[PDB]
Design an enzyme around this catalytic site. Structure first.
Site, PDB file in Angstrom:
ATOM      1  N   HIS A 116       5.530   6.861   7.063  1.00 21.83           N
ATOM      2  CA  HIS A 116       5.104   6.570   5.701  1.00 21.83           C
ATOM      3  C   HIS A 116       4.324   7.757   5.186  1.00 21.83           C
ATOM      4  CE1 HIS A 116       1.715   5.472   8.216  1.00 21.83           C
ATOM      5  NE2 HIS A 116       1.018   5.983   7.219  1.00 21.83           N
ATOM      6  N   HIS A 143       0.818  -1.232   0.000  1.00 22.79           N
ATOM      7  CA  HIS A 143       0.000   0.000   0.000  1.00 22.79           C
ATOM      8  C   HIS A 143       0.854   1.286   0.000  1.00 22.79           C
ATOM      9  CE1 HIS A 143      -0.361  -0.040   4.573  1.00 22.79           C
ATOM     10  NE2 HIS A 143      -0.316  -1.343   4.350  1.00 22.79           N
ATOM     11  N   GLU A 202      -4.811  12.705   3.335  1.00 23.25           N
ATOM     12  CA  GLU A 202      -5.922  12.003   3.999  1.00 23.25           C
ATOM     13  C   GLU A 202      -6.746  13.042   4.766  1.00 23.25           C
ATOM     14  OE1 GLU A 202      -4.162   8.336   5.868  1.00 23.25           O
ATOM     15  OE2 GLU A 202      -5.247   7.573   4.143  1.00 23.25           O
ATOM     16  N   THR A 232      -5.860   4.622   9.410  1.00 26.18           N
ATOM     17  CA  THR A 232      -6.559   5.003   8.174  1.00 26.18           C
ATOM     18  C   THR A 232      -6.539   3.919   7.128  1.00 26.18           C
ATOM     19  OG1 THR A 232      -4.679   6.055   7.073  1.00 26.18           O
ATOM     20  CG2 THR A 232      -6.079   7.444   8.557  1.00 26.18           C
ATOM     21  N   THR A 233      -5.945   2.770   7.451  1.00 27.77           N
ATOM     22  CA  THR A 233      -6.098   1.564   6.636  1.00 27.77           C
ATOM     23  C   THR A 233      -6.621   0.442   7.526  1.00 27.77           C
ATOM     24  OG1 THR A 233      -3.972   0.367   6.986  1.00 27.77           O
ATOM     25  CG2 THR A 233      -3.951   2.180   5.431  1.00 27.77           C
TER      26      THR A 233
HETATM   27  C1  LIG Z   1      -2.572  -3.479  13.693  1.00 25.82           C
HETATM   28  C2  LIG Z   1      -1.150  -3.709  13.183  1.00 25.82           C
HETATM   29  C3  LIG Z   1      -0.727  -5.141  13.558  1.00 25.82           C
HETATM   30  C4  LIG Z   1      -1.519  -5.972  12.526  1.00 25.82           C
HETATM   31  C5  LIG Z   1      -1.765  -5.072  11.278  1.00 25.82           C
HETATM   32  C6  LIG Z   1      -1.019  -3.777  11.630  1.00 25.82           C
HETATM   33  C7  LIG Z   1      -1.351  -2.434  10.976  1.00 25.82           C
HETATM   34  C8  LIG Z   1      -1.263  -2.463   9.461  1.00 25.82           C
HETATM   35  C9  LIG Z   1      -1.882  -1.165   8.932  1.00 25.82           C
HETATM   36  C10 LIG Z   1      -1.333   0.062   9.608  1.00 25.82           C
HETATM   37  C11 LIG Z   1      -1.514   1.294   8.948  1.00 25.82           C
HETATM   38  C12 LIG Z   1      -1.060   2.466   9.486  1.00 25.82           C
HETATM   39  O1  LIG Z   1      -1.236   3.599   8.708  1.00 25.82           O
HETATM   40  S1  LIG Z   1      -1.827   4.978   9.458  1.00 25.82           S
HETATM   41  N1  LIG Z   1      -2.154   5.807   8.219  1.00 25.82           N
HETATM   42  O2  LIG Z   1      -2.959   4.590  10.156  1.00 25.82           O
HETATM   43  O3  LIG Z   1      -0.773   5.527  10.237  1.00 25.82           O
HETATM   44  C13 LIG Z   1      -0.356   2.435  10.704  1.00 25.82           C
HETATM   45  C14 LIG Z   1      -0.187   1.217  11.359  1.00 25.82           C
HETATM   46  C15 LIG Z   1      -0.693   0.008  10.851  1.00 25.82           C
HETATM   47  C16 LIG Z   1      -0.446  -1.322  11.546  1.00 25.82           C
HETATM   48  C17 LIG Z   1      -0.443  -1.268  13.060  1.00 25.82           C
HETATM   49  C18 LIG Z   1      -0.241  -2.637  13.736  1.00 25.82           C
HETATM   50 ZN   LIG Z   2      -0.819   6.855   7.224  1.00 26.79          ZN
END
Ligand SMILES: C[C@@]12CCC[C@H]1[C@@H]1CCc3cc(OS(N)(=O)=O)ccc3[C@H]1CC2
Ligand SMILES: [Zn+2]
EC number: 4.2.1.1
Length: 258
Positions: free
Chosen positions: A92, A62, A104, A196-197
């Site tokens: 990121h 992503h 965003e 946000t994902t």
């Molecule tokens: C929940 C987790 C463990 C399992 C899956 C993991 C996610 C994957 C998506 C994600 C996107 C983000 O982007 S943002 N834009 O929110 O800062 C920031 C962080 C995480 C991590 C955090 C840790």
């Molecule tokens: Zn982000």
């Protein structure tokens, strides 16, 4: 059929696998600057990145994450709206196919070309994975990017992207100093929200800086050469990896400044 940013698996579909997508504290949001209230009880942000130790950069399908060694108390965010100390783990970006979109968060509906997220976890929860299960587990510092002058402190990131073109590629990325990505002012807005994902966890105190950074057209063009797909798969340019603004619901956005 995993989540992404396309017509068939994009933000409007996420709620099927992740029902919290329609939850009460989802991110991002539009920041309505006239409704945001100055909160004189907010403290100045403390961003202490002098000892930050970057390790690696990863295309995760992503975005690209610049990852930090968070095994010691080094690069920390505190103060502002935060109680306690939050440790930097990764940063990121989100960006557009065109300069007119990509952020965003929006500011009075204005979309910036891109948005940088520096992700930090609350040390009281011991590690990143446990922190995301808590409502105050993360603090994400958000910084808008506009296209103008180059950001010299970004160029080391831009130049490594050729080596992580596709999903699952990583590269060593040591000694990168994230202080070179910060604007002059630390004036901010803050509100409670989410990742946000997917999995869209409601674990984030958002701190969004008012002052954008400028990056050059050439710098952001290089972000747009990355790929969502893995090597040897149909090429899908990594563009428009932003979630649109979500309903504010029962939340207040607070400003650190008059
Ligand atoms: C929940 C987790 C463990 C399992 C899956 C993991 C996610 C994957 C998506 C994600 C996107 C983000 O982007 S943002 N834009 O929110 O800062 C920031 C962080 C995480 C991590 C955090 C840790
Ligand atoms: Zn982000």
């Amino acid at each position: 059929h995993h989540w992404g940013y396309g017509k068939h698996n994009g933000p409007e579909h996420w709620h099927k696998d992740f029902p919290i997508a329609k939850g009460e504290r989802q991110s991002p949001v539009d920041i309505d600057t006239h409704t945001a209230k100055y909160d004189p009880s907010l403290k100045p942000l403390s961003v202490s990145y002098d000892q930050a130790t970057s390790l690696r950069i990863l295309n995760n399908g992503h975005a690209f994450n610049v990852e930090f060694d968070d095994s010691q108390d080094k690069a920390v965010l505190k103060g502002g709206p935060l109680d306690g100390t939050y440790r930097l783990i990764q940063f990121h970006f989100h960006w557009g196919s065109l300069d007119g979109q990509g952020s965003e968060h929006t500011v009075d509906k204005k979309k910036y070309a891109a948005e940088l997220h520096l992700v930090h976890w609350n040390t009281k929860y011991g590690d990143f994975g446990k922190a995301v299960q808590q409502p105050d587990g993360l603090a994400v510092l958000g910084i808008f990017l506009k296209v103008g002058s180059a950001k010299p402190g970004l160029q080391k990131v831009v130049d490594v992207l050729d080596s992580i073109k596709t999903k699952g590629k990583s590269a060593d990325f040591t000694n990168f100093d994230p202080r070179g990505l910060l604007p002059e002012s630390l004036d901010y807005w803050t509100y409670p929200g989410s990742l946000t994902t997917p999995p869209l966890l409601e674990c984030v105190t958002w701190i969004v800086l008012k002052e954008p950074i400028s990056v050059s057209s050439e710098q952001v063009l290089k972000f747009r050469k990355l790929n969502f797909n893995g090597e040897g798969e149909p090429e899908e340019l990594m563009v428009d990896n932003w979630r649109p603004a979500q309903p504010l619901k029962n939340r207040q956005i607070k400003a650190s400044f008059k």
